[model samples]
Target: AHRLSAEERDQLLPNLRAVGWNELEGRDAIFKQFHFKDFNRAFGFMSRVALQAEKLDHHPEWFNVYNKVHITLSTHECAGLSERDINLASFIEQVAVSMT
Candidate 1:
């Protein structure tokens, strides 16, 4: 996988932030938190993501509570960000947005 260059990261910043992803302090990854109406919705969302993650062969680091799920996207193989993370993150946001 091609790691995103600094230029690419800069160009992608706004779009990523617009989708609720933020760069955490001292972290080389992006973070996002999703809120759902209830545990059922949250779990359903995770299930959707899990299925896609398996398809992509790139799993995310995530934590879930009753109605909130926190996710971090990074490419450990590259030891930084990559196009794979961007692609998966985009899909994740889409899945979350489409959730009711």
Candidate 2:
């Protein structure tokens, strides 16, 4: 409904940070990158996340580097970080953890 509150950010941001998510400087986005041993592993990670992204109706901005992937999450309409960002980021971490 709204951008994440200060209290919410304090609690939620650390959890993501622990999983290697970094706050993008000069912007309100969270970013993370995964490097797998092979393209199949990286693509598998993408396919898993893609389904959840569609389910949430919140797609990520991502790039592929053969065996690596980079993702950034932010609520564009909110013009900042929102609960949707947090949720998707959490799911992304879950899939990543399971694969690796």
Candidate 3:
């Protein structure tokens, strides 16, 4: 995907916020912590997201600790959050919201 221009990035912010996303600085990725009922629920969420990430060819820097899943998304090839990263992040949130 193409890199976002300054004005485009600003405009995308509101849309990002609608899906629980935010921009990161430099090449750093935005971090999010998802808390679930237990390890089972957390791992289930991870499994679902992993498949999506693989399909998009974009992976997340993540760690799982019992009931919590921490994720950081960045487009290493692009050296920043590209439009693909934003799209995946937004989709992941939608998936998470649907999970029990």
Candidate 4:
């Protein structure tokens, strides 16, 4: 995994906004909460995301309830969010929006 410098990380934050990621609370991880109509819808979203994650060899640390998904994105291999995390977050957000 490639690591990003502070400048590169700062530069990438705005670009990541196009994908619906909220700011990182701490460290280099960013988070987003997804709300759906029902458990079924939410689970479906998870399923889709799971497949995408597997394909990319990147996965999210997430938790789910009936209609909510709380997702934390970071590159565990790099011990932080790198360019890859931002890219995956963007793609996940795009796929999620299409489901709405």
Candidate 5:
């Protein structure tokens, strides 16, 4: 909906960063990498996240290989970081931890 305000950034970003999320250097987006035991686990993680993304209507830009998934999150409407990115990133961390 709206770009992240400084107050919100201060309040929210640190927690995500603590869990591996990072701010892109040249972009207003958050990025993270997930590693699984194998393709099966990796695909399962993506499938779960995909359903959440579709439900939220806030998809991510992601790349997946056999056991690694890299994800970037941003809000196109605001063209910047927002709460949606935080929400999705948090969901991603949850799904990741449940894996091996």
Candidate 6:
């Protein structure tokens, strides 16, 4: 697939914002960070995300600190943002919700 078009970005970004994704200033990427109950909860979230990321062959750039997990989603295949990022972010959001 290719990077999202300007039109797609215009339309899709608003919806993504409702769930807390934000565009990066110097790059074509999106970022979000989640805070869970504790380290076990954070690790469970990462484990769930890892399984889905593996299935998609698209993984996140992430960091975890205690109850917090920071995530950045970008498509290496397109060298920028893509539908894959949106879908994966949406899935990640759902996983976080279902966990708690």
Error of 6 at 27 (Å): 0.4
lDDT of 5: 0.93
Error of 6 at 15 (Å): 2.4
TM-score of each: 0.92, 0.94, 0.82, 0.84, 0.97, 0.95
RMSD of 1: 1.1
Worst 10 residues of 1 by lDDT: 11-20
Candidate 4, run of 10 with poorest lDDT: 15-24
* Model 3, span 9-75: residue lDDT tens: 6765576666556555655456677788888878878888889888988898888899888777777
lDDT, candidate 1, 12-78, per-residue tens:
7678898789887786888998999999889989999999999999999999989999999999888
The lDDT, on a scale of 0 to 1, for candidate 6 is 0.92
Residue pairs of candidate 2 with colliding backbone atoms? none
lDDT for 56 in candidate 5 is 98
How well does candidate 5 match the true structure in TM-score terms? Answer: 0.97
Q: How well is each residue in 1-100 modelled by candidate 2, as lDDT tens digits?
A: 4788899999889989988999899998899988888888899999999999889888999999899999998887888899999999988888887776
Which candidate leads in TM-score?
Answer: 5
Off by over 4 Å in 6: none
Better of 1 and 5 by TM-score: 5
Better of 5 and 6 by lDDT: 5
Query: Model 6, range 48-80, lDDT digits (tens) per residue?
Result: 999999999899999999999999999998889
lDDT value, candidate 1, whole model: 0.88
Tell me model 2's lDDT, rounded to 2 decimals.
Answer: 0.89
TM-score of 3: 0.82
Question: What lDDT does each candidate get?
Answer: 0.88, 0.89, 0.74, 0.81, 0.93, 0.92
Candidates ranked by lDDT, best first? 5, 6, 2, 1, 4, 3
CA displacement after TM-score superposition, residue 9 of candidate 3 (Å): 2.1
